Structures are given as C-alpha cells and as structure tokens.
Design a protein around this ligand. Sequence first.
Ligand SMILES: CC(=O)O[C@H]1C(=O)[C@@]2(C)[C@H]([C@H](OC(=O)c3ccccc3)[C@]3(O)C[C@H](OC(=O)[C@H](O)[C@@H](NC(=O)c4ccccc4)c4ccccc4)C(C)=C1C3(C)C)[C@]1(OC(C)=O)CO[C@@H]1C[C@@H]2O
Ligand SMILES: Nc1nc2c(ncn2[C@@H]2O[C@H](COP(=O)(O)OP(=O)(O)OP(=O)(O)O)[C@@H](O)[C@H]2O)c(=O)[nH]1
Ligand SMILES: Nc1nc2c(ncn2[C@@H]2O[C@H](COP(=O)(O)OP(=O)(O)O)[C@@H](O)[C@H]2O)c(=O)[nH]1
Ligand SMILES: [Mg+2]
Lengths: 431, 441, 359
Amino acid sequence: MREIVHIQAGQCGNQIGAKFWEVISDEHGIDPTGSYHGDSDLQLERINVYYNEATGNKYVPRAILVDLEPGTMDSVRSGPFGQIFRPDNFVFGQSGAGNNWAKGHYTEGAELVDSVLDVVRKESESCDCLQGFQLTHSLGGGTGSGMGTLLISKIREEYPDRIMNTFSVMPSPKVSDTVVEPYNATLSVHQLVENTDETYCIDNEALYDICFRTLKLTTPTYGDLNHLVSATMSGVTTCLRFPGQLNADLRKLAVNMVPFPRLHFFMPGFAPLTSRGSQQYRALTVPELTQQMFDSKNMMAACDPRHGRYLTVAAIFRGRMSMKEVDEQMLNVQNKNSSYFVEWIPNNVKTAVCDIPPRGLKMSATFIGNSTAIQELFKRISEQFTAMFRRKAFLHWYTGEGMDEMEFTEAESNMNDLVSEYQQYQDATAD
Amino acid sequence: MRECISIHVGQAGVQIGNACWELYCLEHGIQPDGQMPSDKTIGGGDDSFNTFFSETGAGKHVPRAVFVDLEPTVIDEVRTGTYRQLFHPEQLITGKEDAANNYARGHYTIGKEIIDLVLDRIRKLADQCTGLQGFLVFHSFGGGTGSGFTSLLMERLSVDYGKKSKLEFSIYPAPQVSTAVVEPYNSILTTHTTLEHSDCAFMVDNEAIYDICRRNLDIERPTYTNLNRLISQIVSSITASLRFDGALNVDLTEFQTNLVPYPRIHFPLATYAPVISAEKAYHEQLSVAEITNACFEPANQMVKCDPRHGKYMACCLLYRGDVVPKDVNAAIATIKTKRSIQFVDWCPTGFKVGINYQPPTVVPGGDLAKVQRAVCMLSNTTAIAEAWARLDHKFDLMYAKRAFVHWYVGEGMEEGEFSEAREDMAALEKDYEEVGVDSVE
Amino acid sequence: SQVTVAVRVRPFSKREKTEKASQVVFTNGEEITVEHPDMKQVYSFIYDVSFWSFDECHPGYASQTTVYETLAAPLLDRAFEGYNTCLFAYGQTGSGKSYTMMGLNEEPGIIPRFCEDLFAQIAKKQTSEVSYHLEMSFFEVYNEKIHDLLVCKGENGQRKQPLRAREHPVSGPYVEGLSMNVVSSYSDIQSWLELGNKQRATAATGMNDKSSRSHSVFTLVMTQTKTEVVEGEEHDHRITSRINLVDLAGSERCSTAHSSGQRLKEGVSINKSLLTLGKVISALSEQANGKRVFIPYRESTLTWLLKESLGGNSKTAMIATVSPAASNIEETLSTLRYATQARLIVNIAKVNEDMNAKL
Ligand SMILES: CC(=O)O[C@H]1C(=O)[C@@]2(C)[C@H]([C@H](OC(=O)c3ccccc3)[C@]3(O)C[C@H](OC(=O)[C@H](O)[C@@H](NC(=O)c4ccccc4)c4ccccc4)C(C)=C1C3(C)C)[C@]1(OC(C)=O)CO[C@@H]1C[C@@H]2O
Ligand SMILES: Nc1nc2c(ncn2[C@@H]2O[C@H](COP(=O)(O)OP(=O)(O)OP(=O)(O)O)[C@@H](O)[C@H]2O)c(=O)[nH]1
Ligand SMILES: Nc1nc2c(ncn2[C@@H]2O[C@H](COP(=O)(O)OP(=O)(O)O)[C@@H](O)[C@H]2O)c(=O)[nH]1
Ligand SMILES: [Mg+2]
C-alpha cells in the first residue's frame, strides 16, 4: 500500500506542522494521546498513507523536523499535539544560521544532513511501498531553505522515480518581512527547479487579503493562515486516502500538470471560504465553487492571472456530487474566458472526486494551476536581485563561509531563463 | 455448454461491474451471497445458468469474472461492501502504483508483476469452462490500466488462445469533455494494439449519456452509477441470447461476423431505445415502430456521431419481450424507405436479428421503469471516422510542440512509437474514407 | 539556416548476402522510399541530402571521401572565419556508424580526414606571423552524469569521477577539472581516441555486445594567434574556435527488448537526451527562419554544454546511418522519424498586413 513522508525545517515548517497534523488528526479521528476516538470504520482503513502503527492501538505520524535552533521546537513540545511525535524524529542542532543561506547549506546543513538521513532512511524503509515525499518550508529564512534544499538534492540523487513535493513559501512584493529574501529564495529556486517534480509556490499577502477582505476576520495570526495552507495540503491527497467516483494521486497531478519538466511551479486555491455569519446567504453547489475559485481573490500568490494565461489546471473535489455538473461547468468556463487558456492544448483540466468530505462540510474543492502569472513573482525577484548584485551589497557574508560570485551569477541566469520560458507563451501566439 | 469470461479493468471497469453483477443477480433472482433462494422456491433445474455462474456441491455460486485496477482504493470496497462474500477472493489488485494516466506504466513497468497472474487465473477458469471462453473486456481509454494493461492482455491472449470471440466494450472520450489532459496519448496507442488482436470493440461516450440524462428521463444531477446501469442493461441486452431461451437465439460468434466486414473496421456503436422514466413510462404505447425509429435517431445514440455525415456498413439488433417478427419486418422496411439514410451498395441486406422472450428487469430506486419489451442496437458506420479524425487534430499539435511527453519515456517508452502509431490511425481513416463510395468500375 | 541534416546507408555485407536479406529501401535519388513485406502500406521521406551508398556503380555514388568533401568545406570555413561548429551522428549497430566516422586503417572515415586536412592547412599557413595551438578533450554522458574518458584511472574501483557543469557569464558552459591535451600529429589523437573509446561503456543486450549505454563527445579547441601591432609586439586578440563531434546511441525500445534493472535506466536517460536534442534542433531551424523563440537548453546536461556551440553564428549538422535489413525495419524507420522535423517546410502559413511603405 501507498505511503507518504513529511519534512519540516526552519520556523515556518515547524509552525505549519503544528497546525497540519493538528487538522489531519481530527480528519482521521486521532487525539493528542496518539489514540483513536472517531466513529466510523473508514478513517482507519487508509490512515497508513501518513501514519505508522503502535502498541496500544495508538498511531504516530512519519513526520520529521530539521531546524537547527531548539528555540522553536520547544514551542512544539509545550504544545497541544507536541507529545505524539517520536522524540528521535525531532532532529536538531545548535548555532542558528542568521537568516543566511550559506550557513544553512555549506557549513552546518552539510554537516547535519547525515544525522537527518539517519532518521529519513529509518522511516522510509519501514514503508511497504512508496509514492513520494513532502516538504513544508519557506525562503528568506535560513535552515528553511538551505538545509532543506540540500536534503531535496540528496534525496533526488537517491530516488530518481519517487516524487518530491515542496509546499514552499516565496516572498511578497510589497512588504519584505526579511531583508535578504531575494538572494536566499533565488538560490532555492536554482537548486529546486531541476531537483523537484512539483513545487507549490505560495505567498503571504494573498492570505492577508483573504483574511481581511473575504472572511472578514479582524485580526488574524500566522496560525489562522497556516490553517488554510494545511487544508490546501489536505484536499490534494483526499483521493489517495478515501474512495471516490474518480480517484487520483500525486503522480497523476504532477504528470497531468507538468508538461515540461522545469515548468512545475504551481499556484493553489481553496473553495468554499465564507464569513462565519454570512454562509447563510449561499448554496453549497458546484457553480458557486467554480465561480469563487478562478477569481483573483482565492489564490495564494497575489500574482495577476488576467495579466497572463494558464497552461493547465487541476481540481480535486470532495463530497457527494454529480460529475455531470462539474463537466458542464468546466466546459462553460473554458468556453467563456477561452482567451485566458491556451490554443495549443485542446483541453486544459482533469478532475478528482471523493465521497468523504471533512468533519463539518458537505462540498469542497482544492485548486491547482500551472500558470504564467508566476512570472512577475520572478521578474520582481530578479529585479530586486540585480539592484543588489550591481554593487555587491551584502555579499561578503555569503562568501566568507566559502562561496563565490559565480554561483550567484548561475542562479540569476537560470532564473532569467525560466522567466523567458514562461514569457514564450504569454503573447497572442496565433499563426 | 457455452460460457463467457468477463474481465473488467480500471475504475471504469470495476464500477461497471458493480452495476452489472448487481443486475445479473436480480435477473436470475439471486442473493448477494451466492445462494439460490429463488431455487429454494422452485427447487431444481438449470436456472442458475452456467453461461456465467459456476456452481458447487454446497450450493454456493460464483461468476466467471475478475477485475484489476492497480489502485486498491477502489476494489477494497468490493472486498468489504454489500456484495463482498460473492466474488472470488482473487481480484488482482497489486496497486502498489497507479497508472499515472499514462500508457508507459500500464504496458511496461507496471504492466508486468500481474499479467502472469491474470493469464494464470484465466487458465484456472477456462479448464472448467466446457465451451467457448468468449472474452469480454470492459475497459476505457483515457483511464490508465484499461489502456495499457488491456493492450498487453489482448495481444497475449491472441497468442495463447486465438480463434475465439474477444470483445471490448471500451469507453471513448467525448470530443469536448474530459477528466484528463493527456487523454489522447492514452487513447490512441490502445487502438494501434487492438486493431490486430481484438475482433470487435464497441464504444460509448460519456457526454452522450450525459445528454440523455435530461432529454428523456428528466434528470440533471446524475452520478456515474446512473450511467453504469445503462451500460449494464446494454450488456444484458447482448448476453440474454446465450443466457435464456429464445425464438431467434444469437451467439457472440455471430456479432463478430455479421458486423465486421473487414478486419480493421471493427469499431461499432451501441444504443438502447426505451430509456424512459416511470412517469413517461405511461403516456405512451412503446410500440415497436417508434422504438425502432428511436434505434436510428441521432439523439438517443450513445456517442456524439452524427451518422447523416457518414453511411451504414451494417446494423444489428437484439430485441426483448413480447415481440412479433412481422412487426419487426414492418419497422425494418419502414426504416429502409427513408432518404435520410444511405446504406452502401455492398450491404443491401443491412440487418441481423436475434430475439429473447425474457424482457429486462427493474432495479430498486434506480432510473428506468418496468416495461413489457425493450430493444438494443449495434451499428458499424462510417461517421465515427470523423471522431477519430478529431483526435489527430487533438493529437498533432501537442506532439508537434512536444507537450506532456517526458513523463512517458521516464518509464521506458520511445517517441517514434507515436509517429508509427499516428500514420496507422491515419491509414484507418482512409479505409473509412475509401469504402464509402458507390463504385461503378 | 543551413543545418542540413543528411542520411547514409550501409551496403549490405557478404554475411548478409549469405542470408539474402531482402532489399527494403528503394531510392529515386533525391527522395527516399521504403517498403514492407505486407506490401500495402508505404512511406516517403525527403531530406536535403541523400547518400545512396548501397550500389557500387549506380550514378550519384556516395563515397567516403565524397562524404568528407560534401560537408568539410563549411567546417574549415566557419572555423577560420572565427566561429564554432559541431557535428551530430545518429544510428545503431547494423548501421556501422564506426565505419562512417572512423572508417578503417585502409578505408578512411571522417575524423581522420578532418584532422589531417586541418594539420595540412595549419602547416601550410604556419608563417612567423601566426601560431595555431590546438588542444583536445573527450568525455561521455551516462545516466545524465558527465564522466571523463581521457582519465588514466588510478588504483580504485571504476568510480568514474563525476565532474560538474558550471557557467561563466562570458563564454558560459564549461567543466571544472576537465583534462586536456595537445595535438601535433594525427597519430596522437588517434591513440587518445583509441583509448578513450575503451572506457565508454556498452552491454550485451539481446541484440549484441557493443550497444553503447552512453553518449560520446569529442571537442577540439583551436587558438589562432596572428594579431600583431604596428607600434610593437602586441597581440590585441587571440581568436578561439570550438570544433565538436559526437556519437550517440539509438533509441532503444524497452517494449520488445524486455531488459530490466540498470540497463533500463541507461536507456531512459539516453532517450530523454535524444528527445531534448531533437527539440533543440527544431528550435534552431525555427529561429534561423525569422521567428525569435526560446530554446529548452537547460533540460539535459549535454545540451547545457553546447548553448554557445549550437547557437547564433554556429553552423552545424547531423548525419544519420541506417541499414535496409528486414530485421531492422522498425529501428530504421524510427531513425528517419527522429530527423525529418528539421525539414524547412513544416506547413508554415502566410500572413502580411503591414502597409506603411510610404515615404
Ligand atoms: C457551523 C460551521 O460552519 O462550522 C465551520 C465554520 O464555522 C466555518 C467558518 C469554517 C471554519 O473555518 C474558518 O472560518 C476559518 C477560521 C480561521 C482561519 C481560516 C478559516 C471552521 O474553523 C472549520 C470547520 O470545518 C473545517 O474546515 C474542518 O473541520 C477542518 N478542520 C480543522 O480546521 C480543524 C482545525 C483544528 C482542529 C480540528 C479541526 C478541515 C478542513 C479541510 C480539511 C480537513 C479539515 C468547521 C466545522 C467550522 C469551523 C470550526 C468554525 C470554514 O472553514 C473551512 C475553510 O472549511 C470557514 O468556512 C468554512 C465553513 C464555515 O464557514
Ligand atoms: N462511461 C464511464 N466512464 C468511466 C466510468 N468510470 C471511469 N470512467 C472513465 O475512466 C477514466 C479513468 O479511468 P481509470 O483508469 O480507472 O483511472 P484511475 O481510477 O486513476 O485508474 P488508472 O488510470 O488506471 O490509474 C475517466 O477519465 C473516466 O472518463 C464510468 O463509470 N462510466
Ligand atoms: N506563511 C507563514 N510564514 C512563516 C510562518 N512562520 C515563519 N514563516 C516565514 O519564515 C520566514 C522567516 O525566516 P525563518 O524561516 O523563520 O528563518 P529560520 O527558521 O531561522 O530558517 C518569513 O519569511 C516567514 O514568512 C508562518 O506561520 N506562516
Ligand atoms: Mg488509477
């Protein structure tokens, strides 16, 4: 049977795990004791996708943590679901990076990679089979990029056929919550594009626009945003875990969405989302969802789609439905805004369905899209780069631990080339 | 006496079986578990007919079928659901990996480790079958396993067993709708591999039944099951000849002969005329003339193929219920009188017929309604070529720009296979473009 | 462009004459045709050039020296004019690519004529006012890793030392620690190549032994030093030129050839590389015909080596070997189908609405 692994690094990855496993436990019906309290005879039928076995009929995740500074992992252990994890799987060290990439890829990440593999191999060989690997990390940090990118490089050097998904984070246009987001995220985008089947590029500000304008929440915390990133990561795999009138997996998504191998930088979305005291005035039906999805106010990049085109999309549904309505709505959508989609691909979507939705809902949908609006995220990144490398601003830090300017130049060249690949298709493209 | 092995493949196959066997058990009056309380009411005879179901000394029964999907998310329902304790525990579900909506995994890397077991079980079923092993494959294009694994299985069976009846009730993409993006690449190669080894391969399109769902039986929110039952009634309208007594009985060895003029043009279409609702089951006669009229109309066809753009190479019919061959002849001659239809000169006969007294049977809480007779139709035309001719314009662009490709060869496929297949399909189009001319000299 | 892919054929053999393998390929000269013992279906392929080398006395014969003089003048021209040039070969066992590239000691192939005419034009023009300094490298690609062929291995297992590919902003792709040597006689490069072919790997597939599981690259750098200044001895520049040759594998259907384990990985990598190369060549002819368009350079490793040696003012070509054996037909067909997309006519439409020819 199929199995999946999860990796986490940096502060963001740990803090996202502390919400994601806290959600999946309520989906499959598990508690902070590692114990079962559900109702069905179904949630325990395919729980092995994520979780391992126990002694007292408890259950455990196959999760791994990486981060170098203990000052975050302690927040887990003094946390709600912070005593289910195997304490051996909380791999750590000391001597934090300093929001540096070189101090997380070369000095200490390159040191700690073996100790991390000492757990990775243990958990991977326990699986009767395998489907792929996850990651939940960010850029602009330290360990959340360097150590994790090194991990992905090694792991793909091992497993050329298994899948590696990286539900990462990329920095924002307007606010730069860290100064040197561009250099670190650029090195990551270099060491990711060739060493990944698919990465789910996600941005902060779209979540803020959602929680401020759409759900009409007043004052959210990071938890209330990772609370959406988790559901994004969860509706993907619902096909794999629970039955449905049309199944799916990670491979069908990555293969029916990554035509060219480099072009695998995706854009997510979730549906339904409404204010607490306003879902009275709607209907839980496919038309409402398909109208709410493709709008530019439910994505997670703040990157204008109407400024570009979509190569392809993917929509994983969850509930008792009627596939005819899905098909008719999708054809209508391709028919109306047809210019937004591509000429040289005739149909530009697949589907996936499950007959088992979350604990309190009747109908849901997760959106995935291979687009070209990811351009401006990257033209902007390269612009913020070439505004800095033009005078060697912060360079001596990244060099003093044993780098050279050549690697930076290589990263810039690869980013610009991927940008031009994306720009190949944005125009009319007619005759 | 005479039997028919039935394989179902992919989620399409498994769901279609989950409908079909639930039909077959109710037709013969059979419990889920495998007993015959209907026989306990009757007490003897051959009614638990050995055409499909083998029997034991203990009384339990079992159908002579299997199914494989390479995705245990599906069939583990059937290992545990309502119909669990019926089927043979051998359902080969080595679904360590999915078929990725690709034909490379279904035919080479994941095409191995099972196929040996499948042929072994086909042997373990055949040596007790004391008649034909007329094969039925309920597979689908687009879907993963039912393309590649099916292509392997049929070409292998061509070498193992050969001179038998091998049929494919395949499923074809709608020209606009899909649940996939690389559906043509997974649909075209199975044609290249079936064109030599399968003898006849019926076809459907999901969009056509989706259009049926509202025009006639007045529904607009259907599931897949509500189509699987139509498929099941089609297959019943075929098999009911071999199964039960009849006036004009037909064997599966007839369908392969009276509808396959040439070896390569063996790709017909299928319809079932009375598709009408319990409310609309009243308000109308359902006489034979109007039924057979619907058996040539464009709407109630199970495929988006306007036959008025093509011609009819042949048409077969299988009727049910209280039927009168003179009424049948009147309907046929009424249909041959129209200028709206153009049979070819080299098929003046056109029609083959077969009859069974036993009508169909209702299924609880479903869609259809009990009637006193019914009809099914099969037809080899020359209009379906256009549909194939659409896929080349849905193929050639992508293979030219080389989109959605590198995820194939990563599992062992060569690119030239595409082109060597492409022109083959092109040649097939020429055959459908060649015969449709009333030759003089 | 004038990339000008070309095709050759193997006259059968005395061994094949024993078996009397039925001729499948018919030729009208400029076009090429083919048959199939079903004798209903038919194909017809066009190319810029046709070397119908089967017959011995037929007009328009394809001689080895004629193969040289067909494609040699653009090489020396485009080099001495300062630019770089590559050559691609494609074909498999039974097509005898070795017979084409290398020939025999007595039957001269392609490489030896090239290097010898090079040395000829060198020693002819070797004034005091000029210096020609030429150096060599030879490596291979294997499961999408680079490996040096020229390395005199040390005491170890056969951990074929994997170098890496990196990028200068000025001249772009290259390798660190890439060994080089010097050329002053055809015999020296002959010995170097004779040893380099030994470490390149094959395996006894169902077909035969020497089915290569790698792609073999041969590179020569030439330094032209004539620059001399009127004020005094100052070389204001020293011209560089890159010459390249490469031999490749087939396409290796794993469908019929049910070989598993490690050979499958090799074949899959080889096929991916061949795919990317075909796409690159399509983009080339699309780009030298009036349409600026991206190139998928960075997909493979090999192509990433060549982004300057196969672009801009770089005129190269491809050669395709075959054999008309009945037991090769599919492979034969596949070979041609890899190349013909470089055809000039691929159904390009016509559009023109610009109308401001005024003033
Ligand atoms: C009466 C009612 O509608 O209860 C809802 C609810 O009020 C709303 C607001 C829920 C609620 O979600 C939010 O409003 C929200 C709050 C902060 C940040 C982001 C979202 C809800 O939390 C979400 C939750 O439904 C879920 O999403 C699943 O329970 C969720 N599991 C968890 O979030 C979870 C977290 C910690 C511990 C245990 C469970 C889930 C979703 C997808 C996939 C797997 C699990 C339920 C019933 C509700 C509340 C609780 C109010 C909605 O949640 C979603 C996106 O499905 C928001 O709109 C839906 C439905 C409702 O409108
Ligand atoms: N007409 C009809 N078509 C169906 C039905 N179920 C599935 N299909 C078609 O089958 C296709 C996918 O089939 P599958 O091969 O089972 O896909 P899967 O479940 O992922 O299994 P693999 O593709 O082999 O990995 C879909 O695109 C549908 O169009 C059905 O019940 N009726
Ligand atoms: N979206 C989101 N981002 C986070 C969260 N926690 C940390 N981050 C990101 O982490 C980055 C800060 O760098 P960080 O990863 O903490 O450095 P490091 O952990 O020492 O490697 C910022 O860009 C944040 O956006 C979170 O809960 N949500
Ligand atoms: Mg599947």
